[PDB]
Design a protein around this ligand. Structure first.
Ligand SMILES: *[C@@H](N)N(C)N(C)C(=O)[C@H](Cc1ccccc1)NC(=O)OCc1ccccc1
Ligand SMILES: [Cl-]
Ligand SMILES: [Mg+2]
Lengths: 216, 67
């Protein structure tokens, strides 16, 4: 039997790794990643969407001071769209909202929340829906300098969620189950910008504590 | 400081003054040693993952996630 494993990069549902830089826009990268996967699923086109659009225009969030992916999805729904990266390029600092409906590249019909702490529910969503926005504890030096392998540090605090990233699949490496996680710290972090995070290790780093995905 | 210079230049790092630069160098040195010890532990089966120096080398792990 083939293993049960999913990797949306292989199916063309994931854009290249971005670098958020100095700006606290992890939430905006996580949100556009989730929207990028649903757009690919809906329309067959893979397109970079605008994190800057979210940073400048999601008034329920705090731009470079941080925010929630759920508030981003609600903004795209209420706004009746989000711009392409091309129509609204990333400058890595908050500016006046300059949304332009002519650059619109995606829409949103709401969002779904994964039940708190339920890694099997997150797995079913990745498998059946696509890339899912997730929040983790990324506060450890072991995460800061992750290079390769399956990240599992017992000091990780599932109740200390301080970073937003994108689950793009799941699998197993050298007998260690993992989530495939796209980060937004550039391709010089991790494995070309990715980290494998321990799966079914009692919700390691709070991976399934605040997971959400947009409806399209 | 050959390696520290190449690291600063490669990552376009600037500091406000000598005290700030030496403070940052000290964090980086401590992180290099942490990386070396972790990877030695990983070679002995202690960890399922390995570390490497990157553009966040001169920062605390809290600073990376909490501006
Ligand atoms: C990341 N670059 N950065 C500043 N972070 C950590 C955030 O934006 C976090 C991400 C996050 C999402 C879900 C759960 C935990 C963490 N969000 C954040 O700090 O939100 C603060 C906020 C301010 C104003 C309005 C809403 C939220
Ligand atoms: Cl959120
Ligand atoms: Mg630390």
């Amino acid at each position: 039997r083939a293993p049960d494993s999913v990797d949306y990069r292989k199916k063309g549902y994931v854009t290249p790794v971005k670098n958020q830089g100095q700006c606290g826009s992890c939430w905006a990268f996580s949100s556009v990643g989730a929207l990028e996967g649903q757009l690919k699923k809906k329309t067959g086109k893979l397109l970079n969407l605008s994190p800057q659009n979210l940073v400048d225009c999601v008034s329920e969030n705090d731009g470079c001071g941080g925010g929630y992916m759920t508030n981003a999805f609600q903004y795209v729904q209420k706004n009746r769209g989000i711009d392409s990266e091309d129509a609204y390029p990333y400058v890595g600092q908050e500016e006046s909202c300059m949304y332009n409906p002519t650059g619109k590249a995606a829409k949103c019909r709401g969002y779904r929340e994964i039940p708190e702490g339920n890694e099997k529910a997150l797995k079913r969503a990745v498998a059946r829906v696509g890339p899912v926005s997730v929040a983790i504890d990324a506060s450890l030096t072991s995460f800061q300098f992750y290079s390769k392998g399956v990240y599992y540090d017992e000091s990780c605090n599932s109740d200390n969620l301080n970073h937003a990233v994108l689950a793009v699949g799941y699998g197993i490496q050298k007998g260690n189950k993992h989530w495939i996680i796209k980060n937004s710290w550039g391709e010089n972090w991790g494995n070309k910008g990715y980290i494998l995070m321990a799966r079914n290790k009692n919700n390691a780093c709070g991976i399934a504590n605040l997971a959400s995905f947009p409806k399209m | 400081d050959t390696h520290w210079e190449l690291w600063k230049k490669t990552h376009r790092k600037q500091y406000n003054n000598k005290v700030d630069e030496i403070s940052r160098r000290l964090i980086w040195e401590k992180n290099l040693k942490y990386i070396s010890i972790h990877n030695l532990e990983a070679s002995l089966g202690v960890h399922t993952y390995e570390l490497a120096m990157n553009h966040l080398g001169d920062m605390t792990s809290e600073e990376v996630v909490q501006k």
